[PDB]
């Protein structure tokens, strides 16, 4: 308004000739053109001087072309539905279609209750094959005596996992919490399955939204991961991917003291993933030391080389079996592909570059791995070339 008052007090209209009128109009137009907030465009737009100089038809084109600079958009997000309930069958089908489109757990529970009431014994978990469940958990999820409870638990599981897939973790959290609170009454094994599923979903959520900018977890996710890594519970069915992401997160945030010292002894014998996490943590914490680092770099070397070895034409990629390693080659590649930490990534690149140098390529801490290897014939140099190519592509994806 100081600009516009100065403009008005200095223009001296009806005697300013055409040149000054045009130049003042241009200045006002182009001081609108750069305005980031349209309300200010509105300021000069309402001003009497603005209306006075230019014309009665370019002001409208100006205001509309500044409105389309940041247009407001309204769109229908709700799915189409040809709902119109005459017969029992049409009612059943329309309600099952809604069951498909429903993602809030309470609406699903309502539609499942009404369908089980209207029908006699038909299950409604199978009204869509696109609903998936891990096979280690299908057997337990089908052991509930109540049909409606089993159906609701299944549909909640499937919708929560598929939501976790599409990175819409709010819905997954809601659905999973509903299932967990519903299953606390009758089945402790299903409660433990739900606990692990919440743990994995929270880890995924943190690393998707809560991280991505370098903020510490609230330290209870770390405690939950720690408790999950020390269950010692044989009856509970487990997914190895939950443990894999536990170790991947745990090694993402440099907490190498626990994996090096506080890890239970039996876990290293049991889970190869925890063992690899410990080895990377130990070989990353000792980088300052020329000699102390070698004590862990040595077993990291041997573990990785027999990982890429072939026991007995045979190829590691073509067969994927006959390997001496405790960990699969593609599983090792995936486990690495959940690491975004730069120090561990460069350690791993030096590990596979030195391995690809024997039969050069230089990758930072390249003098830390030993040179002489046992069973040089057993390792697959073509497999290591493939693994190093994929590994370097992933590393140039994380930090381009």
């Amino acid at each position: 308004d100081f600009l516009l008052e100065v403009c008005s007090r200095s223009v001296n209209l009806e005697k300013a000739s055409e040149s000054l009128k045009g130049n003042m109009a241009a200045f006002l137009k182009n001081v609108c053109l750069g305005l980031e907030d349209l309300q200010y465009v509105f300021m000069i737009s309402s001003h009497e001087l603005f209306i006075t100089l230019l014309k009665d038809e370019e002001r409208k084109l100006l205001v509309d072309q500044m409105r389309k600079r940041s247009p407001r958009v309204n769109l229908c997000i709700k799915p189409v539905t040809s709902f119109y309930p005459a017969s029992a069958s049409v009612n059943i089908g329309q309600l099952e279609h809604q069951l498909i489109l429903s993602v809030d757990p309470w609406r699903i529970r309502q539609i499942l209750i009404e369908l089980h009431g209207m029908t006699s014994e038909r299950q409604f978990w199978t009204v869509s094959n696109k609903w998936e469940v891990p096979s280690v958990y299908s057997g337990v999820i089908l052991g509930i005596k109540d049909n409606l409870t089993r159906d609701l638990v299944y549909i909640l599981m499937a919708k929560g996992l598929h939501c976790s897939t599409v990175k819409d973790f709010s819905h997954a959290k809601q659905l999973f919490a509903a299932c967990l609170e519903l299953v606390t009454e009758f089945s402790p094994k299903l409660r433990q399955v739900m606990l692990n599923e919440m743990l994995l979903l929270d880890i995924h959520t943190h690393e998707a939204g809560t991280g991505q900018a370098g903020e510490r977890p609230p330290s209870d996710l770390i405690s939950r991961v720690r408790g999950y890594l020390e269950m010692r519970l044989p009856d509970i069915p487990l997914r190895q991917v939950i443990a894999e992401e536990c170790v991947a997160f745990m090694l993402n945030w440099r907490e190498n003291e626990y994996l090096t010292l506080q890890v239970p002894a039996f876990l290293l014998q049991s889970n190869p993933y925890v063992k690899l996490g410990q080895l990377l943590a130990a070989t990353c914490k000792e980088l300052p030391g020329p000699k102390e680092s070698r004590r862990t770099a040595k077993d990291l070397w041997e573990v990785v080389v027999q990982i890429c070895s072939v026991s007995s034409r045979v190829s590691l990629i073509k067969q994927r079996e006959s390997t001496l390693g405790i960990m699969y080659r593609s599983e090792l590649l995936s486990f690495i592909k959940k690491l975004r930490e730069p120090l561990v990534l460069t350690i791993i690149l030096s590990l596979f570059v030195k391995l690809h140098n024997v039969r050069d390529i230089t990758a930072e801490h390249i003098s830390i791995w030993p040179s002489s290897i046992p069973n040089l014939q057993s390792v697959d140099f073509e497999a290591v070339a493939i693994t190093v190519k994929e590994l370097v592509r992933y590393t140039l994806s994380i930090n381009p």
Partner: protein, 326 residues
Amino acid sequence: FLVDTAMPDTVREACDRLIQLLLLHLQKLVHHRGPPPRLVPFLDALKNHVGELCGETLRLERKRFLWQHQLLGLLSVYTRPSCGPEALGHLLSRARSPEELSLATQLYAGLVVSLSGLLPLAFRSCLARVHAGTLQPPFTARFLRNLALLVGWEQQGGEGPAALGAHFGESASAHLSDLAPLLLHPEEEVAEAAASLLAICPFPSEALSPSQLLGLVRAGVHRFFASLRLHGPPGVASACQLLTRLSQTSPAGLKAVLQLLVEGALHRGNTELFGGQVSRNQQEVIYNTQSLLSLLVHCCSAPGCGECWGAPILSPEAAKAVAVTL
């Protein structure tokens, strides 16, 4: 024929009941027995016509469009190559109004409960068609501006994008390299559509590759300079926003954009816009120079009430780089 004969009123109602019960039955089939998949010969003759199918649904008539849309949802859920991305790409690159484009959001909302990764494949597929001779330029422009509307609508987060939950911005960001050559594409409408997508489309979360960063920067300055040569100060904001967004990326990108903007300003091209020697109106020269110098000040000035009249401090290093380039 059936849809034409659902719109003798008794025969109309007969066809209407037929198509509704047929949709109920197909929906039971495509989604059941959760074992080899069932076969629906009816749908298996439709995958060749899914694109044609989309066209009918995009006519947005009174009642046929609803049936066709549920048909597309069912077909997509059925087809093992998951034709859902193909349907979404057709809806995106064919819609012409916000209401038609609402169909694509409706379709994805119906899909995301059964299908996953449809935005990456839809774009990975749409931009793949783009890098070829198909998808005549108006169609690609329609796809690009519908994507621009999608990312803008998602950015102004309310209840809509909160519930749809697409991540349009990310799933268009991972294709910034594929969008970049289009800013050199000859026909102006595709170029501006790509630029206006880019200005608002977020850069990848990790970083921009030096090849990506530099190609984006060159494309942005070319758009900015060409945007200006044809539109002038009003029509460059897109590029400018992008350039400014590029110039705050990192000191490498800042120095690259400042050096390339200063060099392109002083090349034998982009010199007659600023009174360069080898008659032109002066007024346009002052205001072209206004846009270029405002961009430079935006790129140069430090981002981020500091009193009501104060002004942001120009950084020393940006002016140092402008100095050495000069």
